Amino acid sequence: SMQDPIADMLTRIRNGQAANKAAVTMPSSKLKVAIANVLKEEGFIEDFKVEGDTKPELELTLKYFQGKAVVESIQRVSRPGLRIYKRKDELPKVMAGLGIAVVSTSKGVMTDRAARQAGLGGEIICYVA
Amino acid sequence: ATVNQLVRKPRARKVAKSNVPALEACPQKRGVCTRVYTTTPKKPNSALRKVCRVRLTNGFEVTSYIGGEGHNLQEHSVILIRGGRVKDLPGVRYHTVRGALDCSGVKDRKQARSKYGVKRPKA
RNA sequence: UAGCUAGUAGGUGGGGUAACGGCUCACCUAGGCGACGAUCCCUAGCUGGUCUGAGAGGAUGACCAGCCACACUGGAACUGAGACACGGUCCAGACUCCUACGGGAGGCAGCAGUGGGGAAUAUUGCACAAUGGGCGCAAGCCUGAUGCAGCCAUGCCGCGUG
RNA sequence: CCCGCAGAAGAAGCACCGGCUAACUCCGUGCCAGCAGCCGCGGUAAUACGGAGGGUGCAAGCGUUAAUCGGAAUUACUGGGCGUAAAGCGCACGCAGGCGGUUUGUUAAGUCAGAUGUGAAAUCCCCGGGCUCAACCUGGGAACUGCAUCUGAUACUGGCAAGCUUGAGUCUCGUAGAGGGGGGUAGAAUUCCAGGUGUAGCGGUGAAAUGCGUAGAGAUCUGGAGGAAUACCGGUGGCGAAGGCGGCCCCCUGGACGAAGACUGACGCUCAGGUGCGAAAGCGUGGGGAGCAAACAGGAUUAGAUACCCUGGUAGUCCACGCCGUAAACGAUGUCGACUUGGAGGUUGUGCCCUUGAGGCGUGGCUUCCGGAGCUAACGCGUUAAGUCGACCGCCUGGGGAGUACGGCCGCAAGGUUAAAACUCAAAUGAAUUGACGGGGGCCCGCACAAGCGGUGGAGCAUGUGGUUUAAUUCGAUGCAACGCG
RNA sequence: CGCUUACCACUUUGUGAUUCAUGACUGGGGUGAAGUCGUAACAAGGUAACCGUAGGGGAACCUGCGGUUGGAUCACCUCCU
RNA sequence: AAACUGGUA
RNA sequence: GGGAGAAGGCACGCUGAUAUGUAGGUGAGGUCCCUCGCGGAUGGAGCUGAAAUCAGUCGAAGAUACCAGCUGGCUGCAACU
Ligand SMILES: [Mg+2]
Ligand SMILES: [Mg+2]
Ligand SMILES: [Mg+2]
Ligand SMILES: [Mg+2]
Ligand SMILES: [Mg+2]
Ligand SMILES: [Mg+2]
Ligand SMILES: [Mg+2]
Ligand SMILES: [Mg+2]
Ligand SMILES: [Mg+2]
Ligand SMILES: [Mg+2]
Ligand SMILES: [Mg+2]
Ligand SMILES: [Mg+2]
Ligand SMILES: [Mg+2]
Ligand SMILES: [Mg+2]
Ligand SMILES: [Mg+2]
Ligand SMILES: [Mg+2]
Ligand SMILES: [Mg+2]
Ligand SMILES: [Mg+2]
Ligand SMILES: [Mg+2]
Ligand SMILES: [Mg+2]
Ligand SMILES: [Mg+2]
Ligand SMILES: [Mg+2]
Ligand SMILES: [Mg+2]
Ligand SMILES: [Mg+2]
Ligand SMILES: [Mg+2]
Ligand SMILES: [Mg+2]
Ligand SMILES: [Mg+2]
Ligand SMILES: [Mg+2]
Ligand SMILES: [Mg+2]
Ligand SMILES: [Mg+2]
Ligand SMILES: [Mg+2]
Ligand SMILES: [Mg+2]
Ligand SMILES: [Mg+2]
Ligand SMILES: [Mg+2]
Ligand SMILES: [Mg+2]
Ligand SMILES: [Mg+2]
Ligand SMILES: [Mg+2]
Ligand SMILES: [Mg+2]
Ligand SMILES: [Mg+2]
Ligand SMILES: [Mg+2]
Ligand SMILES: [Mg+2]
Ligand SMILES: [Mg+2]
Ligand SMILES: [Mg+2]
Ligand SMILES: [Mg+2]
Ligand SMILES: [Mg+2]
Ligand SMILES: [Mg+2]
Ligand SMILES: [Mg+2]
């Protein structure tokens, strides 16, 4: 059965990038839309759209450089069977700061840079590079 | 192995045992040289060698190898043994310490005297 | 090593301790612990720390410092503010020693030192001059704590052998 | 601590030099003596043994032994694996446990933020100071990654409350199927019994023999008894969780799939222990027993043959009720869920249509083959993944000893399950490459065979060799490729 | 003071459990230049091999039942268009 | 049809 | 199923109290019922009567006399009555 919609979303994004597709089809959710906004702001997707009331649906548009996918790598971190929470003074940085990490702080989800400059830690959702 | 499985049963480090069991980790031990053997090595080698069956002062029956050229160990003689094993000879995992206790040093030795326990020519 | 517990778990009253308490009695209830490992068996003084490792970890607890336990073996209590007491007491036990054979004594896991065991580990030394303790108004006395010295290339560091 | 006298006067050794690993020659020895941390050296030209010269490393030390960590990502939390190298339980159902779709409110446990208290000193680290420098001593700081309390945050996880339908499930109409249990019946064939005709063989092997037959076999025809299995259909077919399930008919009964429509509203996934099913062989009781066939007997083959072969033949194979619980129980691949280019088939449903047709266009379930990216040590897998991910469980840590011993549990027994240590070796192992070989296959050639002639091996003699003897019978050469050879 | 009751150490008896040594004899395992008998496996290893189970035999092994490939070799010119 | 075996380094 | 009464331990007399004789058994009178009376219910006088706890007490000895298993270990034979 389904156990991790966030992992499903990340896997779908990675598979779409590998297959060089235009957009993806998913069921929407609060974390899904929030991390989608975190991605748009970061430059990993053109745009995301949500539609439908009884069965909300979320569609993401992927980005490609001249011949390569923008999302070099993406993996889940705080797995459901093993969750991790980090301090403020220490927070993971992907590719020595070139990448970003999605962290669910008390003041909503945001990147590791934003969380560090705000001054509050939280649960690390995933790394994106 | 899943994290839950590891929680229920942690990883156990591989155990290790010394290849030269001489009581509780002693550097040398003295014995009485029960008897003197001369056995034969394995296939690639062909040369008889000087062996002794030593009875440790507070231990068991072990087999030790007498190095160098020539010795003076016969019947009962108190002698020290150290670690180290001879590959050719099976069951031999100890070396008699030449030039210690009743055991004498090797004659006319000019190189590596510290081993074999040979006094430097005074001059 | 899968079941273990009758003062066992709880309550009322009496007793007891400096103090709460099944700490201990009389009675009432059948409870309490255990797979998040009880009970049983083997091993072990614990820690700050030390070694190793980039880290996480692994090994370890020698010296110094904090806490615990013990003082030939088993048991008990007295005195005392504080002991169930290393150089106190009583009883019992093993061992050793003295004896005029009637009867008595002993406890270095305190500092030296001896026998023994082991591969292996030192002087039967000087001083209370300094620090610190006990008594004393003080002077002062005691202090194998302590300060020094003797032996060992056991370790780290430095110098020479031009 | 300072000063003065004299005088190089009193003060250097240990290991190693084949590769790892810095540093080479000679002599002695000749698989002996010896060396050796691993690979391994030494059987007359040793850089590996012993000595000498030379060189390298360290130095009042040097080397050996003992012990811990590291290297070892070789217990992998950081940070490993299970198709074939060790490793998926034979399969399934399920308690505890682990994890869990979506909408809002609330709590503030987990989580995060700030403050206070604490975390002895010494030790570690940073900046300084003093012993003639250093070791050593010492001032301040940092650290002391922790713990407790209080005050806040509410994104996520958890708790409580209220909802939703996409996960899961129920209802209606149909389909295919060796799904399972019980009962009945049919055809062919083998064997056996009775009878008829008939007469010298039958049978079996590579070739034989045993064996059967003139007391009439075998072959052939008629009648009868009994046991077992269902010939094609039959298939890169089907059903079942697995094991496994084929004549036909009846009764009872499980599962799967298709059409829409309605209903419940997270009711789910996984699962240690536990329970159930589980080929063949095997065991117990009672039946049955045609064929086949362990054991056993005889005949063959062979140097031997208690084997392969032949002639017989008991248990067993069959039935009912119990037990055993093991297989190369294999797809050597755990279950569940999501995503990811295609092509050619099989089997079973269903929708639209010029519907002319054994036709066009779609949509499901199961199943076979080939292949893209990707993965993989490679072979290969590849939408039915061994690709990208998530949840849980089982299992692995060099080879042998050993799935063995002891103990526990189970069984009537055979045995099953859980599961070590001592000791021994430096390997064991997987995939693939080149060669060689095969009592594998294909093609081809040579006086290779076949078809012929003439020979040798028989006799006498010449010559060479082996052996023997001798004072010496000089020394070589030895399958083809030595022997009228030097 | 003496006596007496309660607690209790040494000590004694009976019967169990567990563990360490040792024991006539006996089973299997490992190592060993160069012994004796056979040739079971690797090629189709000359009867394909192996797994479970049962019986048998100096020995490797053989045979029966089921299972696996982790096995080397084929509709003999005839038929389809 | 039969058709074994090959000391050690 | 047994072995097993395995083996081996503790208590045992008399007096008093709990209870002027308790738990228990039996059961008159009185009352009600009238089902039909050798009836039912209720009631309890009287009679009888263990076992146990606490305290005291005598003796060398309290199952005091008669009566009333000896126990354990190895092994041959036959299963057993
Ligand atoms: Mg009280
Ligand atoms: Mg208490
Ligand atoms: Mg490391
Ligand atoms: Mg410790
Ligand atoms: Mg007092
Ligand atoms: Mg005292
Ligand atoms: Mg003393
Ligand atoms: Mg002393
Ligand atoms: Mg001694
Ligand atoms: Mg120095
Ligand atoms: Mg070199
Ligand atoms: Mg030479
Ligand atoms: Mg490690
Ligand atoms: Mg690995
Ligand atoms: Mg399987
Ligand atoms: Mg299940
Ligand atoms: Mg959730
Ligand atoms: Mg909280
Ligand atoms: Mg300075
Ligand atoms: Mg300091
Ligand atoms: Mg500190
Ligand atoms: Mg919530
Ligand atoms: Mg149903
Ligand atoms: Mg299980
Ligand atoms: Mg059967
Ligand atoms: Mg049977
Ligand atoms: Mg039968
Ligand atoms: Mg036969
Ligand atoms: Mg198995
Ligand atoms: Mg099968
Ligand atoms: Mg198969
Ligand atoms: Mg398997
Ligand atoms: Mg393929
Ligand atoms: Mg077994
Ligand atoms: Mg067993
Ligand atoms: Mg020619
Ligand atoms: Mg010819
Ligand atoms: Mg001739
Ligand atoms: Mg010559
Ligand atoms: Mg000649
Ligand atoms: Mg010659
Ligand atoms: Mg063979
Ligand atoms: Mg064969
Ligand atoms: Mg087996
Ligand atoms: Mg032979
Ligand atoms: Mg007898
Ligand atoms: Mg009898």
UniProtKB/TrEMBL annotation, chain A:
One of its GO terms (biological process) is translation. One of its GO terms (molecular function) is rRNA binding. Coiled coil: none annotated. It holds the Pfam family Ribosomal_S8. It comes from the Bacteria. The keyword Zinc does not apply. Keywords: Ribonucleoprotein, Ribosomal protein, RNA-binding, rRNA-binding. One of its GO terms (cellular component) is cytoplasm. HAMAP family: Ribosomal_uS8_B. PANTHER family: 40S RIBOSOMAL PROTEIN S15A. Belongs to the universal ribosomal protein uS8 family. Part of the 30S ribosomal subunit. Contacts proteins S5 and S12. One of the primary rRNA binding proteins, it binds directly to 16S rRNA central domain where it helps coordinate assembly of the platform of the 30S subunit. This is Small ribosomal subunit protein uS8. It comes from Escherichia coli DEC2D. The gene is rpsH.
From TrEMBL, chain B:
It holds the Pfam family Ribosom_S12_S23. The keyword RNA-binding applies. GO terms for biological process: ribosomal small subunit assembly; translation. InterPro entries: NA-bd_OB-fold, Ribosomal_uS12, Ribosomal_uS12_bac. One of its GO terms (cellular component) is cytosolic small ribosomal subunit. Mg(2+) binds at R30. Keywords: Acetylation, Metal-binding, Ribonucleoprotein, Ribosomal protein, RNA-binding, rRNA-binding, tRNA-binding. PROSITE patterns: RIBOSOMAL_S12. Coiled coil: none annotated. NCBIfam families: rpsL_bact. This is Small ribosomal subunit protein uS12. It comes from Escherichia coli. The gene is rpsL.
